[PDB]
Amino acid sequence: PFPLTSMDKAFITVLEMTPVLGTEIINYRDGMGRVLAQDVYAKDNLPPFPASVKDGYAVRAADGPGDRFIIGESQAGEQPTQTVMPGQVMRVTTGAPIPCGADAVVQVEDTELIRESDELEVRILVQARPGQDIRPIGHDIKRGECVLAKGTHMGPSEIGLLATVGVTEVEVNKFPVVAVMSTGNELLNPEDDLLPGKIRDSNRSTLLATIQEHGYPTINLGIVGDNPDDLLNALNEGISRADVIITSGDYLKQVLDIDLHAQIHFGRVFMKPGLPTTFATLDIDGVRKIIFALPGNPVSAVVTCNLFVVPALRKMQGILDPRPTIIKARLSCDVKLDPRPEYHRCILTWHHQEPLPWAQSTGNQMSSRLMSMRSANGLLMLPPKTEQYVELHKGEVVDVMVIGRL
């Protein structure tokens, strides 16, 4: 049928053929996880007024040290109206603006109070430098300055930065809309009771849940019968409604090739799990849709999803490096190597008294399944077997692909 594709070549070919989506304008509040499709420039200075860094008094530096009469106090949120004259001083708090007269601030720790209300007068013990302990206009952000670059993957801190500079509408890359479907005559919906010869569909739920975790919109195309007619109709719906189509479980490849006239890039990959993984592209009206045909085995489905689909989705949403994060960790258990590169869901746990994290296998289902109250947050990357190394022992360092919040 199809040539056997090496693990690396399959990955690179997915990323090379996956397009980067168009742009749209969104509100800054909904910008979480988005990638900027524009530079963002500040239209104000921050601060827009000279502000004290310390609690104390704003003084005229040329006055030097001595006794001064306190003419008032500058309160935050109100631009001061009084002017500090020689021999005068003004009480200031941190967030408060500097009055017209002063050019420096001396902190209260370096002053002594002289007269009190029935504060009236203070003695300045230090010679202030001009501009001392004051954040001048535009100290943090200057007008016209680019505060965020195009390509920035925005998190909460960036959202606040936009809020600061007053850029409430911003152009970003669209998120991919992902349609997911399952094929098979044995599949029933989870909501349904079992019938003879049938089982419940878990692949659809898992895949959708995985894509939702990354914040992408999804479309449930439900379970499709294993026949070209129902299969073609479902795909046409997926194409017309979504940017990505994912199916799990010979009829499929025929429809893509003969009916949709799509380009199937590979149909088998030298890996475990995930051997029958198929990836195809389809160009309709200058728009490229991509299709993932994942294996029917539930573990094979979720593993291949994180390896091929998730990085593809990240490139699509504008992430400059859609490649997954890979960390070094220790096996919690002994494992045998396969001629194929192998992958297992695992749980990463960091021990305060140990430099590297531990990886505990859970991909040994259907016999002994570790019931932990922690969800698997890692993808163990086991190497192909060699003449010398046939097995890896507890404690030895392997690659682990991070596949969730820790």
Partner: peptide, 9 residues
Amino acid sequence: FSIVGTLYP
């Protein structure tokens, strides 16, 4: 960068 496990001595 490769998504294949790397051996350690």
